[PDB]
């Protein structure tokens, strides 16, 4: 009875995180994330982790498989999806799962209508998944009390325990709503390995975003309108349902339609066409509470 | 050239005489007529701006229940658009998922591609469009037309305007899971339903159209119908208040058989009465 090894002795992380492609993905996160450090941080965090515990299995310490599901928590255009894209990639990279691909997918692609129907959609989502990653937007709209989505929520867990190599799952939505959907569904706790948060831009980064919109398409704000501007931000900031960017764009847009109806309305030269007067934002119903 | 007449513009592209012919082609949805009325403006506008160099950007995404103008909007958006120069051949392409994606493996991209060749010059317009994206169904190749979908939003712009329409929450759903939709949309619209007080109109005309009468009490029977059918899944405005009115003229029916009294005159028999109204699951939950 003997017992040899036949692992490297040693291995340097550097050269590995190099050469895996790992780095470079997280550098394409950094390029295709408009600065969000915090996250980018934290990812990189959990990427020191996924390359250690790689190193581990390559020395051959490896036991198992480690727990590398997570879960996104945050507001709508903070960074989820995108993070998750380049999530897939890193894993891929660093071998965890075989294929690189993430399948993006919300309530209604597992759960279905009609009694029975649930089961085999969740299994087929669930194929196309396996070797790559599945994101779940709003996971917690599948457990509703109030649709068989419960059976959904176990065919998921059972795999997220059992089968690691082939499926990783990420988790997404807001953070109170996940965190009362953990609270009515233990199990999923024990399964989550990582809990990223996704904070909002700054007020100043808005205004910032809003602004090179606006360049763009040739637009430019009198003094009122960059002042109600700031102040509509603030205010909808702290409405529901905050779409960082997306809800910018939109107001901006939403301004865009207003600015246009009211010259239209009242000849005209192109600073008359670009300029967005304060009306135009002020009308906005943000500023009477809804 | 300055400054430029926005009026002359309106008044020259003949864009007045399609949403004149709006007013006129869509029984009274004043709300969603004036947000279209609205995004003429900006349309005109945006235009104008063009003629003073300052590609424009012009996808949309129409959302709401079946029997809200959708189609015919978009019909009259296709006209506007041509009217003031967006598009080439002002006309629209109506399409369902159906049309874009083939049972066979590799039967989707040129197809996809054919329909795009004659929609080109006009409006592209894809009715459910979240149905492209069936990850539910293994072959299924609705993927490959959102590719191809998506890739000609962004690059062969200036030739084609797509409007995704369909019910808004599985709309939403399908951005979250196919996002860059989002930043190709530059309009979303919102079509709501018809008020009670419309829905209810539309009910007394379908009803004297077929010689109909309701009794005072089987009328507030159908104002409560409606109110509660409006918040059941799948209303359809119109066709829902067809659907309805046809099972109440069946129970009606029935009832007047089932009773037979002797012989029965006109009244009785152009009567609906509370009883046929109310004996609907609409009333018990569903």
Redesign the interface.
Known sequence: MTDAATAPTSIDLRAEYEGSGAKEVLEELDRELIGLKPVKDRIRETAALLLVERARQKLGLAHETPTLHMSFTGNPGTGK?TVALKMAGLLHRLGYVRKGHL???????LV?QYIGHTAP?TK??L??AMGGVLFI??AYYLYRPDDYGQEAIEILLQVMENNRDDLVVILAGYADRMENFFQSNPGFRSRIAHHIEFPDYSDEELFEIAGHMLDDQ?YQMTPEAETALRAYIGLRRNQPHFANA?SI??AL?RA??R???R???A????R???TIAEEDIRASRVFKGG
Not at 267 to 270: I, T
Request: glycine content about 2%.
């Open positions: 999806t399948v993006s997918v919300t309530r209604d692609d279905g959609k087929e989502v194929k196309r937007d709003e040739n997306r764009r939109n847009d865009r339609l600015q246009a109806n010259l239209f309305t000849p005209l030269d192109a008359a066409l670009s």
